Structures are given as structure tokens and as C-alpha cells.
């Protein structure tokens, strides 16, 4: 299950759009969206988005100097097993927007800052069709 | 047809905001257009004119300030068609609107007015709408 990975070359900034289609296999338990500083294992996370199928819940948290910060969690869980999905990711001055099936989802408010993401990462049970940043 | 079709914005869009506009250009379609206004009078002053021109084949982006039009900028060609659907994304960030047409990056066109006084998006023109969405 090796992660995807995209760089931003020249980072994000406000008005950045990641937009990531795929499809939840019907055995998944989790999967994973990570914005991270840099390309070294362990790096912080900007932004940690992680549909629990198995839990039934969506996490969004933040890690730095490798310790998570606190957890937030989304609205029940808009991802079912065997089924596609598009999320939009949108960075704004205030945080980050998470889009789930053309409806906005949750709002995390920066932890780090913006200027330091570097990397899209993908990984956990996930089919992915596209990651395409605009 | 949806049109014309207005999203009120009353607190505002700021860096950071997608407006997405999936819809059908009908057969016989001349234009359409997609606004951001600042008020919602009648010739009301627009921080963006996006402007599909199907019959003479140009996509125009211009400015409306103190009732006056600023000089006219034109996307490369036109990517819509009389007959076929399409989805846009206008993406605004500090520096200005990103316009995405079928998940390709298409113009960008350059704040003229400032971001914070977008009060209001309108559709109309020669376009059946399907959505308008903002993030």
C-alpha cells in the first residue's frame, strides 16, 4: 500500500486547490490525505485527513517535532466502502477548506504555517484516480 | 435554464475562494457570462466579467469600475461548444482569479479591484446552469 506523492514546488498559498478523486475499496478501514513540510520521514503535518471507514468518523489533526497534536473530527463520515469521492483541500489565510462531494465539510485552522507545506501524500485504503493541484 | 442565476455574498469571498459552474452551452448559444459584482444595482461595478463568446470564438475576461470597462483580456481560444456541457472553477487568491475549464488551468487575470468588495455572482446569458457552488 505504498503512499502517493506530489511536490509543490513552489509550496501553497492561499487560493491553492488540491483536488483528489479515488475510490474507498470495499474492504478498506482507513485512508489518508497529508500536507507535509518537507520530504523526510517523520515530517510535520500541516494538515492530516483521515476517513475512519472501520470507526465510522473522519480525523483531522496536525503533527510537529513528530508528537499529533489534538484531534478534530468532521460531521459523521461522507466515504463509503466500495463507493468514489472527490475532496477538494482549498488553503485559505485562515486554514484549510475540506470539500466532500460538493459540499463543504470541515475547516481547519492552520497549526503551521502555510509557507512551510511542501508535499501531498497519499496513502492507507485508497483507489486513487487523480491529484491534481490548481 | 437557471438564469439569470445570483449567489448572494454578503460577508464576502477572500483569497481562498472557488466558485464552481458546471452547466450546458445549448445548440444554438451566443454567450454567457459569469459576474463577481460589487452591489447588486443594475450595472453594478465588477471585480470579474468572465465571458464565453461562442459564436465568434473568444473567452473574455474584463473589469467594470465606476461604470466604466477596463481594457478586455481573451483566453487562448475557446474551450466550450455549442452542444456540450462544461464545468468551470474561479479560484481567488491574493494576486488575482485563476479560471479552470475542464480541470486544465485556462487564464489567469490579475485583482483590478479589490477583492473585498465582491458582494455577488451572476449567471446569465445563453447557458442552461447546472450548478453554482462556492467554496
Redesign the interface.
Known sequence: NVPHKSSLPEGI?????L?IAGLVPPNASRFHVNLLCGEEQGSDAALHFNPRLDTSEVVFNSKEQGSWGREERGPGVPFQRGQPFEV?I????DGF?A?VG?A?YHHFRHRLPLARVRLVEVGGDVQLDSV?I?
Open positions: 498559498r492561499p487560493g491553492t486547490v483536488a477538494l482549498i488553503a485559505s489565510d477548506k470539500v460538493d463543504q491534481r490548481f
